[PDB]
Structure 1
């Protein structure tokens, strides 16, 4: 049976805050399709040769 992730009890209380003291610059790659190959068929020549 697959695991959905590690469980994490967030340290919540009505007067506690967490604030980051540092950062990282992250560079992430996103790849997107933009075109197909352009095609045409002479279908007298496909059907009848």
Structure 2
């Protein structure tokens, strides 16, 4: 609770130089997919289908 009154003010007499950390992602992994190898592998019949 802050002591609000009609004719009172609070003015600082000192200060602090504070340093904080902040982390933000910028990028993600780049991936590629080979359909034939994932779905069929080395199966020529599946590759034809």
**Shorter-chain-normalised TM-score: which range?**
0.7 to 0.9
Q: May I ask how many residue pairs the two structures share in their alignment?
A: 41
Larger Rg: 2
Greater helix proportion: 2
Structure 1: state its 5+ residue gaps.
Answer: 1-8
Cα-Cα RMSD = 0.6
Distance 2:6 2:39 in 1: 75
> Which 4+ runs in 1 deviate beyond 3 A?
none
Structure 2: state its 5+ residue gaps.
Answer: 42-49
Asked which structure has the greater RCO (Cα within 8 Å, sep 6+), the reply is 2
